[PDB]
Design a protein around this motif. Structure first.
Motif, PDB file in Angstrom:
ATOM      1  N   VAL A   1       0.846  -1.213   0.040  1.00 37.36           N
ATOM      2  CA  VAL A   1      -0.077   0.157  -0.098  1.00 37.36           C
ATOM      3  C   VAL A   1       0.872   1.181  -0.018  1.00 37.36           C
ATOM      4  N   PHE A   2       0.889   1.988  -1.077  1.00 33.08           N
ATOM      5  CA  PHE A   2       1.587   3.234  -1.160  1.00 33.08           C
ATOM      6  C   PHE A   2       0.604   4.538  -0.699  1.00 33.08           C
ATOM      7  N   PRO A   3       1.075   5.481  -0.434  1.00 37.95           N
ATOM      8  CA  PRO A   3       0.294   6.803  -0.097  1.00 37.95           C
ATOM      9  C   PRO A   3      -0.771   7.057  -1.126  1.00 37.95           C
ATOM     10  N   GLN A   4      -0.507   6.852  -2.522  1.00 27.82           N
ATOM     11  CA  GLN A   4      -1.313   7.240  -3.552  1.00 27.82           C
ATOM     12  C   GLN A   4      -2.651   6.381  -3.326  1.00 27.82           C
ATOM     13  N   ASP A   5      -2.586   5.105  -2.584  1.00 24.63           N
ATOM     14  CA  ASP A   5      -3.720   4.277  -2.374  1.00 24.63           C
ATOM     15  C   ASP A   5      -4.428   4.685  -1.451  1.00 24.63           C
ATOM     16  N   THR A   6      -4.188   5.669  -0.602  1.00 23.32           N
ATOM     17  CA  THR A   6      -4.954   6.132   0.585  1.00 23.32           C
ATOM     18  C   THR A   6      -5.676   7.332   0.490  1.00 23.32           C
TER      19      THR A   6
END
Lengths: 167, 167, 167, 167, 167, 167
Positions: A18-23
């Motif tokens: 999970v990368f920041p762009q998934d949050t």
């Protein structure tokens, strides 16, 4: 009867951090993102089973059991738990693979229905399915009822569509 | 009794074209993308209703009724059709807005369940909901049964989780 | 005279949360992202008005009035405030919808010019436009001057292009 | 008087191909994407000039002169053409670099205004600017008028904001 | 001696379709995208082996053997083929899974080097590695030489860095 | 002999800030993202040199020398350091442009090999290359050996492929 494939044949894995762009929320995975990945891996499993192009006909359910944080490693396992005529039920399990303490907790669970399609887009006959290990046969054994619920829901849903159509 | 909001108060629109990056099959929208947008607009409606941060607890259903092609304009309309204690049922309708011939066909229909959360992440009490126009009261009137199905599914799903846990 | 559409006919809404991937500075939306969304919703409004494919001919202005933070809900409202022969002026308003205290402050304001195109890419005649409510007629009434400024700017801009061409 | 930087000091290049994900219309770049990249490279130039963090205060204009197709190589050149007290006018030129026939046609032209900010977010004094080559001094010489137009537009725009505020 | 993990323990799978957004050339996957995914799955394998956070220290090689087209299903298999003190060599294999004719041709092959890090960012000791099946021991057996080449390259590369530093 | 281009002719710049979406670890750029950008700018340089479409044949190396944090401005400089028959070695340098203290430290260094292709996809003859400044001739002078290493690696790599093929 038709040709049969083992649930193991189409069983697909996907690992993804999970990368920041998934949050959306601070350091917390957004449900839409999770759903997109679920659909991705499920579609790949349906393709392997069907030996064909597939489309998502419906998302029967996604249960979000646990918050998924940034950095978390997610393991997706998709398999075909039920084969209709042209349709497949794919069940996807999503686990958090905590490499630090080696737990693999179930973070989400999803059922989707796919339809296999031709070169020209008509629904295409899929092979049957049989389980081998215990998990596979748990999903295999409990599928007939889920198929059943889906029929009732497809009944109600048609009612709703028809109401909206006249408004 | 609690404070009540009109379904019109939290009713949210979203218009969005389908771009090549939203597709999987040639010029055809990918289901995962559609699901991510559904979750986005539904979450916004739940926030407006709840006056709070929300998370997706479950995707109760997504029926994909029609293929959605590149270029298509999609209209998403989300509303709260049911308010539990801390939970909301959001129904989202997705229409293709064909500007060339002014039809607005229903391309998909989705139900999701959201939970409103505190500043510190515990489930938060949401206001009640009442309809005003005819569509609103159709979704309002048919919700109790969907809530009902969800209870049974949450029962079965717990059984599945518990089986996987011991394997 | 030509056929006329109400500014209400093409009026388009878009609601969208700011996610980490939309930011540049810590928890602050990046202007480029905002501009891309402005262009998206404006293009949809121009399509509805024109009943046709459109392209952005120019961005006449984007005034960034307020910082937009991660999590913020943005409401975009696009409408056609002026109809030339083949061109449309779309005005977009962007508000922060604070669900916690129910304020809807204006965060940005944009004017863009679109050209409606054929099946074969030549500029296409658009219908005229008339307002109904007060806001619509404010943008309708102040448009002739903006059109005017644009003419002068298109004059200067041509001068610049011609200078660069010989260097 | 203040310290002065050459327009050459902050002059920034960016080369980027147009990929399918940048398009909306078939094989044609979407204006929003172009605007996001313009803002990216312009912000970098403003940072170099200001020696500081910057925000986009306004997009004064984007003239889209030419269709930009998938595969096209775009060259962005940003420079500071005007320095106010805390603000900078960045002019960006976008050319299609056709490697096959070595033409570098001007595809777009943009003016933006940036404000340099502190460690704590207040507007920060920027150095002055002077040109060296001919292009630089063309943009330098024509800037005072653009600054002028901007003042009038900032007047009108304030009128609009104030009208919307009471509605 | 240190604790030892089987190459099978950290062996990671990833399945992913090629979508239009992954391409540059018409319907052909872009190398940068492939490299990003390679790095993703390799990093996950290094984390599982190391039981820790990791960073990519170097990309030792990526051989692109075959064009990868839109729609193609890619199977990534990463494993640790060599364990230094704080470093790991991850080898990734990428196959096209053609569901239509059941071939799984090798489309790319990559070696990367990862460093395991603390809670505070210093390089962290990793366990040793041993093979079990034939492929694992092929990569295990041929690793010492690759390690060797890397040393020479790290020598030359330092020379280059030092030259650039004085210019 | 063939036509010759200066290394300066194809020399390409790219400036790009690191945004949250480029990161994996907290405020730290992800290697895959960096690799994708390296490949982007390198491909543009190869196109300019070749006057043709190109594909990445291999990533010969990426040395990650320094952590790259969110907000950092990256300068990519790609040039052709070696021209084979149909192939080019592109060397890319990546520097952090710290506008606050005017240092431009080398953050990464990469070598890639590109093949120029026809209108119909066969490898296409590229012009030769010669340096002008000191850096250019450093990369030009040290290339023959790198070419040499690559030959040995292409030998070993073929061995590996052939082993996997029979398993």
């Amino acid at each position: 009867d038709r040709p049969m494939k083992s649930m193991s044949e189409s069983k697909c894995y996907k690992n993804r951090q999970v990368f920041p762009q998934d949050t959306a929320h601070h350091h917390t995975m957004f449900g839409g993102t999770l759903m997109a990945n679920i659909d991705e891996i499920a579609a790949i499993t349906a393709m392997k089973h069907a030996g064909a192009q597939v489309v998502t006909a419906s998302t029967d359910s996604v249960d979000f059991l646990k918050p998924i944080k940034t950095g978390d490693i997610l393991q997706y396992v998709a398999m075909v738990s039920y084969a209709g005529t042209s349709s497949m039920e794919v069940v996807v399990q999503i686990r958090i693979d905590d490499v630090f303490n080696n737990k693999h907790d179930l973070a989400a669970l999803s059922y989707l229905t796919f339809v296999a399609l031709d070169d020209e887009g008509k629904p295409k006959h899929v092979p049957g399915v049989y389980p081998e290990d215990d998990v596979e046969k748990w999903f295999y054994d409990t599928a007939p009822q889920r198929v059943e619920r889906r029929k009732a829901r497809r009944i109600e849903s048609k009612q709703t569509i028809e109401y909206l159509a006249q408004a």
